[PDB]
Write an enzyme that holds these catalytic residues in place. Structure first.
Site, PDB file in Angstrom:
ATOM      1  N   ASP A   1       0.902  -1.060   0.012  1.00 27.11           N
ATOM      2  CA  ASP A   1       0.078  -0.074  -0.034  1.00 27.11           C
ATOM      3  C   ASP A   1       0.794   1.329  -0.107  1.00 27.11           C
ATOM      4  O   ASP A   1       1.670   1.524   0.941  1.00 27.11           O
ATOM      5  CB  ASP A   1      -0.901  -0.109   1.253  1.00 27.11           C
ATOM      6  CG  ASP A   1      -2.090   0.861   1.101  1.00 27.11           C
ATOM      7  OD1 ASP A   1      -1.907   1.682   0.178  1.00 27.11           O
ATOM      8  OD2 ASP A   1      -3.046   0.588   1.826  1.00 27.11           O
TER       9      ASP A   1
ATOM     10  N   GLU B   1      -0.389   4.064  -1.063  1.00 30.96           N
ATOM     11  CA  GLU B   1      -1.833   4.940  -1.160  1.00 30.96           C
ATOM     12  C   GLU B   1      -2.185   5.167  -2.675  1.00 30.96           C
ATOM     13  O   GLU B   1      -1.271   5.152  -3.557  1.00 30.96           O
ATOM     14  CB  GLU B   1      -1.391   6.561  -0.351  1.00 30.96           C
ATOM     15  CG  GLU B   1      -2.716   7.310  -0.295  1.00 30.96           C
ATOM     16  CD  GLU B   1      -3.803   6.939   0.388  1.00 30.96           C
ATOM     17  OE1 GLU B   1      -4.134   7.584   1.499  1.00 30.96           O
ATOM     18  OE2 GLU B   1      -4.592   5.829  -0.326  1.00 30.96           O
TER      19      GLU B   1
ATOM     20  N   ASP C   1      -6.219   6.039   5.220  1.00 29.09           N
ATOM     21  CA  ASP C   1      -7.205   6.942   5.532  1.00 29.09           C
ATOM     22  C   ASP C   1      -8.324   6.636   6.533  1.00 29.09           C
ATOM     23  O   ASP C   1      -9.491   7.076   6.364  1.00 29.09           O
ATOM     24  CB  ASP C   1      -7.943   7.538   3.976  1.00 29.09           C
ATOM     25  CG  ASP C   1      -8.762   6.180   3.426  1.00 29.09           C
ATOM     26  OD1 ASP C   1      -8.639   5.071   3.966  1.00 29.09           O
ATOM     27  OD2 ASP C   1      -9.049   6.429   2.256  1.00 29.09           O
TER      28      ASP C   1
ATOM     29  N   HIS D   1     -24.772 -14.385  11.880  1.00 25.92           N
ATOM     30  CA  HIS D   1     -25.079 -13.119  12.296  1.00 25.92           C
ATOM     31  C   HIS D   1     -25.050 -12.265  11.131  1.00 25.92           C
ATOM     32  O   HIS D   1     -24.494 -12.610  10.025  1.00 25.92           O
ATOM     33  CB  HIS D   1     -23.948 -12.696  13.133  1.00 25.92           C
ATOM     34  CG  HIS D   1     -22.486 -12.548  12.792  1.00 25.92           C
ATOM     35  ND1 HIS D   1     -21.975 -11.507  12.193  1.00 25.92           N
ATOM     36  CD2 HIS D   1     -21.441 -13.376  13.219  1.00 25.92           C
ATOM     37  CE1 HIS D   1     -20.831 -11.820  11.937  1.00 25.92           C
ATOM     38  NE2 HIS D   1     -20.595 -13.126  12.518  1.00 25.92           N
TER      39      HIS D   1
ATOM     40  N   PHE E   1     -25.130  -8.076  13.250  1.00 29.99           N
ATOM     41  CA  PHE E   1     -25.036  -8.382  14.432  1.00 29.99           C
ATOM     42  C   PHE E   1     -26.392  -8.902  15.286  1.00 29.99           C
ATOM     43  O   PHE E   1     -26.231  -9.175  16.519  1.00 29.99           O
ATOM     44  CB  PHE E   1     -24.446  -7.228  15.473  1.00 29.99           C
ATOM     45  CG  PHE E   1     -22.827  -6.855  14.887  1.00 29.99           C
ATOM     46  CD1 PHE E   1     -22.024  -7.748  14.719  1.00 29.99           C
ATOM     47  CD2 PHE E   1     -22.647  -5.548  14.532  1.00 29.99           C
ATOM     48  CE1 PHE E   1     -20.826  -7.141  14.054  1.00 29.99           C
ATOM     49  CE2 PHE E   1     -21.513  -4.912  14.108  1.00 29.99           C
ATOM     50  CZ  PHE E   1     -20.687  -5.806  14.006  1.00 29.99           C
TER      51      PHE E   1
ATOM     52  N   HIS F   1     -28.722 -13.056  24.198  1.00 28.39           N
ATOM     53  CA  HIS F   1     -30.429 -12.874  24.272  1.00 28.39           C
ATOM     54  C   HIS F   1     -30.460 -11.595  24.859  1.00 28.39           C
ATOM     55  O   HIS F   1     -29.780 -11.310  25.909  1.00 28.39           O
ATOM     56  CB  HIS F   1     -31.052 -13.988  24.787  1.00 28.39           C
ATOM     57  CG  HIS F   1     -30.958 -14.024  26.204  1.00 28.39           C
ATOM     58  ND1 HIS F   1     -31.681 -13.372  27.080  1.00 28.39           N
ATOM     59  CD2 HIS F   1     -30.119 -15.122  26.987  1.00 28.39           C
ATOM     60  CE1 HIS F   1     -31.428 -13.806  28.491  1.00 28.39           C
ATOM     61  NE2 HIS F   1     -30.414 -14.890  28.194  1.00 28.39           N
TER      62      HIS F   1
ATOM     63  N   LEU G   1     -31.854 -13.229  19.868  1.00 33.09           N
ATOM     64  CA  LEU G   1     -30.557 -13.424  19.826  1.00 33.09           C
ATOM     65  C   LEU G   1     -29.725 -12.392  18.846  1.00 33.09           C
ATOM     66  O   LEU G   1     -30.120 -12.210  17.728  1.00 33.09           O
ATOM     67  CB  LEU G   1     -30.368 -15.025  19.343  1.00 33.09           C
ATOM     68  CG  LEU G   1     -30.236 -15.911  20.218  1.00 33.09           C
ATOM     69  CD1 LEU G   1     -29.046 -15.693  21.431  1.00 33.09           C
ATOM     70  CD2 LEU G   1     -31.430 -16.223  21.154  1.00 33.09           C
TER      71      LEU G   1
HETATM   72  C1  LIG Z   1      -5.869   5.268   0.395  1.00 33.58           C
HETATM   73  C2  LIG Z   1      -5.700   4.517   1.685  1.00 33.58           C
HETATM   74  O1  LIG Z   1      -5.144   5.137   3.038  1.00 33.58           O
HETATM   75  C3  LIG Z   1      -5.081   3.243   1.073  1.00 33.58           C
HETATM   76  O2  LIG Z   1      -5.151   2.165   2.255  1.00 33.58           O
HETATM   77  C4  LIG Z   1      -5.861   2.843   0.025  1.00 33.58           C
HETATM   78  C5  LIG Z   1      -5.359   2.170  -0.943  1.00 33.58           C
HETATM   79  O3  LIG Z   1      -3.904   2.668  -1.406  1.00 33.58           O
HETATM   80  C6  LIG Z   1      -6.339   4.302  -0.683  1.00 33.58           C
HETATM   81  O4  LIG Z   1      -7.678   4.286  -1.000  1.00 33.58           O
HETATM   82  S1  LIG Z   1      -7.969   5.342  -2.155  1.00 33.58           S
HETATM   83  O5  LIG Z   1      -9.725   5.067  -2.316  1.00 33.58           O
HETATM   84  O6  LIG Z   1      -7.586   4.853  -3.509  1.00 33.58           O
HETATM   85  O7  LIG Z   1      -7.926   6.819  -1.942  1.00 33.58           O
END
Ligand SMILES: *[C@@H]1[C@H](O)[C@@H](O)[C@H](CO)[C@H]1OS(=O)(=O)O
Ligand SMILES: *[C@@H]1O[C@H](CO)[C@@H](O[C@@H]2O[C@H](CO)[C@@H](O)[C@H](O)[C@H]2NC(C)=O)[C@H](O)[C@H]1NC(C)=O
Ligand SMILES: *[C@@H]1O[C@H](CO)[C@@H](O)[C@H](O)[C@H]1NC(C)=O
EC number: 3.2.1.55
Length: 481
Positions: A202, A204, A280, A399, A402, A446, A451
């Protein structure tokens, strides 16, 4: 020599070291993590039983007896103060108080390390940890390494099950403002060969399985129950390495230039740490974290190879999810309410609504069948169980928002997870409590004779702490039918 002693020896030391299972330094004997229990809302810490050793799981069992436990803090063992705490609201709100993310159960991820019990961090959708005030973590284009040992079989395709470097604001501040391990079968951005899940990075506005956006052939589907994911990043270089954490070596699934798209070179890392969530605060993902670190500098293959050898020698094996009386596949039962004033009621259903009702030898045969359940091998986990209706075969207690519903098994992963329950010695000592496999903060509970998959305290009315222990405890009786 623990993993962080090995990184240190490679001149790329840990600046954040996080584990609920064990010390990551041979001389560490401080707190690994903090527990909070539902009975009095007080906390305790769990340390290794020996310096450099395995978490004192028996001390957790003692503190958490006859109640429920959350992991409130995963301490940084490195001394940088980079402790992981309840993740705050960001671009997205989480489902907890003021848009915070849920804390994880203490008991969703039992393992043994060389035969000794310990607990990982089982993270259901909406769970997240963060430190936006981190010290010594790489920023900008500075080199870093990281690794995590994860459950290769606990994942989904929602954004985003991450561990690593993110934004201090908990918002999307652009391409190149993240560098974190991802594990799951998201195909929104990158993906690899087969059906997943994949280890991706990742950065971003993208999960990368390699140099290209989307498909990269060289990133395999993860088989392993325990996966070592090792990721590193420097000046226009990054790598993904993957191993069976239980056996063998790291293989390199990616190594080389930043993806040649707008904003990934140089990188704009902010030094924050996330676990189980996107930068994010995207909080749709699930997964399990056992241990992991972030380093200063770009670890050599040799350093990571030695870390992997140490992980293998720690001997991760699946632990028992089950305690108390429990069940055999094919057994038919009725589950009696133990809450004083409702002790003649049994778990029944009226169509899809799972409820409690008075059932005795004078009830209609209809209701007797509705208050009778065939116990079968858990649909998502073969240690746990699924509860099949006697009057409606092929339908199970699952579930959904929930609430417990009786729905037909549609063969899907999601149904299987939502219909899998792990018997636990009753919190009040009368029979069994049935813990959600997928949301282990929640139990069959419950509330006003209906439930739910309820937590001991929470944002839903049916999460009331009043009578929780009693309301989650059921006696296992001969099926009425
Ligand atoms: C931005 C987030 O912080 C990342 O986890 C994700 C993948 O890179 C991104 O999402 S976004 O929808 O691309 O902005
Ligand atoms: C991630 O893997 C899961 C499980 O194999 C995929 O699950 C399928 O999801 C679709 C709808 O999203 C269902 O109709 C199928 O029935 C599911 N299969 C099973 C076995 O549950 C999921 O599609 C994958 N996600 C992506 C993006 O590929
Ligand atoms: C606590 O739980 C255990 C397991 O069900 C049981 O033996 C014990 O009686 C319980 N005690 C209380 C006070 O509920």
């Amino acid at each position: 020599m623990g993993p962080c002693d090995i990184y240190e020896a490679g001149d790329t030391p840990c600046v954040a070291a996080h584990s609920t299972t064990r010390a990551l330094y041979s001389s560490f004997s401080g707190a690994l993590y903090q527990l909070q229990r539902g009975s009095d809302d007080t906390t305790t810490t769990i340390s290794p039983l020996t310096a450099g050793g395995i978490a004192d799981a028996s001390a957790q069992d003692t503190f958490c007896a006859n109640t429920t436990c959350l992991i409130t803090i995963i301490y940084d063992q490195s001394g940088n103060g980079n402790h992981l705490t309840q993740a705050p609201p960001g671009g997205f709100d989480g489902p907890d108080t003021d848009g915070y993310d849920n804390l994880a159960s203490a008991i969703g991820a039992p393992v043994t390390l060389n035969g000794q019990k310990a607990y990982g961090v089982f993270m259901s959708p909406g769970t997240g940890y963060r430190n936006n005030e981190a010290t010594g973590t790489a920023t900008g284009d500075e080199a870093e390494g990281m690794y995590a040992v994860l459950d290769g079989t606990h994942y989904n395709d929602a954004c985003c099950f991450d561990y690593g470097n993110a934004e201090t604001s908990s918002t999307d501040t652009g391409a190149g403002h993240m560098e974190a391990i991802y594990l799951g079968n998201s195909t929104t951005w990158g993906y690899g060969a087969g059906d997943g899940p994949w280890i991706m990075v990742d950065m971003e506005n993208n999960l990368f399985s390699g140099a290209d956006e989307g498909y990269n052939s060289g990133d395999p589907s993860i088989s392993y129950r325990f996966v070592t994911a090792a990721v590193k990043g420097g000046a226009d270089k990054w790598a993904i390495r993957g191993a069976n954490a239980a056996s063998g070596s790291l293989s390199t699934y990616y190594s080389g230039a930043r993806p040649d798209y707008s904003g990934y070179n140089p990188m704009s890392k902010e030094g924050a740490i996330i676990l189980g969530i996107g930068g994010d605060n995207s909080n749709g993902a699930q997964g399990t974290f056992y241990e992991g670190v972030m380093t200063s500098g770009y670890p050599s293959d040799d350093t990571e190879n030695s870390v992997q050898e140490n992980i293998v020698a720690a001997k991760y094996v699946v632990g028992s999810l089950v305690s108390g009386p429990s069940f055999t596949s094919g057994e038919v039962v009725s589950l009696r309410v133990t809450t004083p004033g409702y002790t003649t009621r049994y778990i029944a259903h009226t169509d899809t609504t799972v409820n409690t009702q008075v059932v005795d030898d004078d009830s209609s045969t209809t209701l007797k069948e509705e208050a009778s359940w065939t116990v079968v091998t858990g649909l998502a986990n073969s240690q746990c169980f699924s509860f099949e209706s006697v009057d409606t075969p092929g339908s199970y207690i699952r579930h959904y928002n929930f609430e417990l519903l009786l729905n037909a098994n549609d063969g899907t992963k999601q149904f299987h997870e939502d219909a899998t329950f792990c018997p636990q010695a009753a919190l009040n000592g009368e029979g069994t409590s049935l813990r959600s496999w997928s949301y282990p903060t929640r139990y069959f509970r419950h509330y006003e004779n209906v439930l739910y998959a309820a937590s001991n305290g929470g944002v839903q009315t049916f999460d009331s702490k009043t009578s929780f222990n009693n309301d989650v405890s059921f006696e296992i009786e001969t099926a009425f039918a």
